[PDB]
Design a protein around this ligand. Sequence first.
Ligand SMILES: C[C@@H]1CN(C(=O)c2cccn2C)CCN1C(=O)NCC1CC1
Length: 119
Amino acid sequence: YDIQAWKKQCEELLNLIFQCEDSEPFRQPVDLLEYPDYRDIIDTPMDFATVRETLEAGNYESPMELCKDVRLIFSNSKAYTPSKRSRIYSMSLRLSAFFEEHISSVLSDYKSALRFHKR
Ligand SMILES: C[C@@H]1CN(C(=O)c2cccn2C)CCN1C(=O)NCC1CC1
């Protein structure tokens, strides 16, 4: 019932994600001028370094907010892929599965802790 525990759990999960080779495409923001069409497709860029920085700045209030940003990484990758014959999209789908399998308990524990606090 620790209301704050999600933060270190999310830091540890980001550490695992950064270690995963499947995160390579997503670790840093897209150079908009390198992939010049990117901002025509993607209204809100997101990447794992931004997520970590947001977390470390104390600018997430809940793991749900972090989750929303991580899921945006994946939706952006899907929106930008030209095909499934892309190593990047393939990596996004695997990393997404990994993230979702690991974030579920974080979310559950946090929401449980909040409920207990309000009981
Ligand atoms: C811009 C695209 C798509 N892409 C993204 O969308 C992205 C970057 C950070 C967060 N996200 C969600 C990944 C990088 N990428 C590439 O094509 N890199 C490999 C190309 C053969 C050279």
